[PDB]
Amino acid sequence: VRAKPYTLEEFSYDYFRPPPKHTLSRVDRLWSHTREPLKQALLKKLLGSEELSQEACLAFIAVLKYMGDYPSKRTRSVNELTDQIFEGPLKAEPLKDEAYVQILKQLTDNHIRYSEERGWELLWLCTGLFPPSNILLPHVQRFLQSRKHCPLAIDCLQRLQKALRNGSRKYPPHLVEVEAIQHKTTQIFHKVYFPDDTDEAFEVESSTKAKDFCQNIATRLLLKSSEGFSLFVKIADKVLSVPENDFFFDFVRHLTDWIKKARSLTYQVFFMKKLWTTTVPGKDPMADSIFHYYQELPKYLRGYHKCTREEVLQLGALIYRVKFEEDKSYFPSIPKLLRELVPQDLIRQVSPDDWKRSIVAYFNKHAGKSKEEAKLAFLKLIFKWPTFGSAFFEVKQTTEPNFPEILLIAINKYGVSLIDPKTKDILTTHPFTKISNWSSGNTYFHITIGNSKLLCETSLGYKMDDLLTSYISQMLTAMS
């Protein structure tokens, strides 16, 4: 005789609700598959809990619907039924074990092959959201270990381990997780976009946290440090940074959920330099090559910096070299490409051909330098400016009377700078150490200086708040 696969029969005796008193009088096991909805939660613990038992029975009808054991429809979202199954356990700890025992029950002595294949998808989704309690965990493991022949059993055992390590998810499975398992694929690959107009596919798991994801990208790109780097999600208008200890799928799911309340729900994942504190051009070749040049270039071309005509001709000739190297066949194309070579505001100062003649003279001075050397030479010249590695915001200030109403705010390693938009002159720099408080709304951004208050009219207060928070935190932890 060969050992039959493990069931929740022995577990049920102590932790499932007892059978109704009439059971023995009646001459369909609680721990086995049914098509009959629950009227009370499986776990003895939820017996008293009315609100929780109610949610446990709603999630079981969603488990039935998903598995084809209860009527439904040709459902709109691929995650409409899975949200109903897991929203309960994700908001309440007592429901986490109910989720596992419900799924395991529906996979025990299940005659229907279509049903059993669907229950496996649910257990795979469950193992990537949260682990079971310490009491249940061995039973879930013995259930999976005795069913190694089922194509998802070894993956569920693996995911359990990652769920015990990384902790629990907060939002239900993302549509990419649900589509992957329905398409019989346990491996997920997500595209990541870089400032050099390239992208790459990186493997992502349900347990993936932005910090791990960032470290895999950094390792791949041969960066000397992942410090100051961050994931960003570009959805609709919005471009948000992803918190270091947040689960990648929770951030995306929540952000897409939020956008759906105020409304194409298409997103892009970016990897970029967020904090520029430790950035020194020359130190890290790939960071300079992929990130620093490409991120500093549009800031420079918007006209956010104060520079001399000698510098704009030098940087102009340097940009040309990044684009075409030693090729002089794009020289007559300089007037047509001026918006790509000279800051916006200065273009009108000189005729298109006088710019062409001046840029052509400065290029020949950059010897026989490569596109890469030109990226470093550009970076090294701008690193001399106190506005290097800044995040610039155009605001309407309401508190300073001697300062213009329209200001340019630069947030960098030195603090918060107020710049005159016309002269590009820094009026004041408030170090992070002198910033005692800050707040934001949809229409503003506020900062308190010392024991001085600054109020900015902006729709970008969320971003400024994030940068101020991240820079102050970075410094404060570095002071330990």
């Binding site: 471009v239 967020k274 991120q295 800031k299 709304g441 503003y444 109020l455």
Partner: protein, 120 residues
């Protein structure tokens, strides 16, 4: 109608100095879908629109936008109200009594700066 409203009957020249004060008489159909922010307590020290949702009533009227200042609700000045006081007054005007809501707003001027894109 709303085109025949004098803000000087309600406010002093100093109170509405440089402000473009208008009367909005919203229809009163379903959800108002208008969010507020600020309050007398807050850094902005006034009640402003934080969002006008695409669904309707405030959007369907079209007179009100994010950043506009709420000055009066059904004749009662709300300029020194807190955010919770303003939200309560707005909801109570929408739910309790009448076939319309009367909002006195200071129309926010156009943004004389790029308030969209950010380079990190």
């Amino acid at each position: 109608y709303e085109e025949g409203f004098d803000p000087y009957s309600m406010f002093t020249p100093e109170q509405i100095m440089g402000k473009d004060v208008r009367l909005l008489r919203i229809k009163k159909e379903g959800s108002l879908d208008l969010a507020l922010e600020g309050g007398v307590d807050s850094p902005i020290g006034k009640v402003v629109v934080s969002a006008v949702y695409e669904r309707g009533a405030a959007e369907r009227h079209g007179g009100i936008v994010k950043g506009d200042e709420i000055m009066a609700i059904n004749g009662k000045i709300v300029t020194d109200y807190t955010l919770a006081e303003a939200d309560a007054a707005l909801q109570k005007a929408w739910n309790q009594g009448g076939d319309w809501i009367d909002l006195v707003v200071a129309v926010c001027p156009p943004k004389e700066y790029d308030d969209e894109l950010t380079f990190f």
